[PDB]
């Protein structure tokens, strides 16, 4: 009971709604959960779901993680630490949602959301992969605005852990797809003070941190004891008028006691 407690203890000291799921990686049933059928904003969490969007057009022979995307200094949007460095020589596909998932980058996620067509795009290949919930309406970095009650660029709790577990496990992507984008989820270097401040010694951690306006925060992740990741935690908020600091604090709290009682 510690942990949905501690969620309860964070949407009052937040003053604002907490999303919880904690997930069997091996049978995908829930094993706890708060307000699973609820919509949050997804905020940067999308951008895995966004490579893996552009992975199974990888395996199809629609795309090429080889290939080399040239932009310009005009394309570039706020938080693009990675690629407003390689404007003469560009980024390739696998450069590109690298950048994405472990620093955040916005214009790479804008760049790899033209590759397959635009948010519509996204939200067709998780329909089409069985989450009819999720969806992205919006381009970076307007996607984040987190209006009250907008259901644009939003997931649920639930949705976005199974539609996780189908990409890293199921049977979509390619072994190979399934592991560049784990791989990538390990890398991440923008998700410090969150889950990864809680993990002991010798736990796996695969992760996509996020951060919004209006309070917007959350996490997805796939962790686990000696090495290998067992369970999906995905934690969103949104509303609270607290920093930054106090909502990663939060979140990582959520974290000690879920490992705790794991």
Known sequence: PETLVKVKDAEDQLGARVGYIELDLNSG???????????????????????????????????????????????????????????????????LCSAAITMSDNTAANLLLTTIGGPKE?????????????????????????????????????????????????????????????????ADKVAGPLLRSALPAGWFIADKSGYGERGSRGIIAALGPDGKPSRIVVIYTTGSQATMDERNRQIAEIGASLIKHW
């Open 122 to 186: 996204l939200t067709a290949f998780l329909h089409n992969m069985g989450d009819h919930v999720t969806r992205l309406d919006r381009w970076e970095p307007e996607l984040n605005e987190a209006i009250p009650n907008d259901e644009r660029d939003t997931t649920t709790p639930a949705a976005m852990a199974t539609t996780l577990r189908k990409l890293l496990t199921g049977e979509l992507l390619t072994l190979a797809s399934r592991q560049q984008l784990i791989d990538w989820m390990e």
């Open 29 to 95: 049933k829930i094993l706890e959960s708060f307000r699973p059928e609820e919509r949050f904003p997804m905020m940067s969490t999308f951008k895995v779901l966004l490579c893996g969007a552009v992975l199974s057009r990888v395996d199809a022979g629609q795309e090429q993680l080889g290939r080399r995307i040239h932009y310009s200094q005009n394309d570039l949007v706020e938080y693009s630490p990675v690629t407003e460095k390689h404007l003469t020589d560009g980024m390739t596909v696998r450069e």
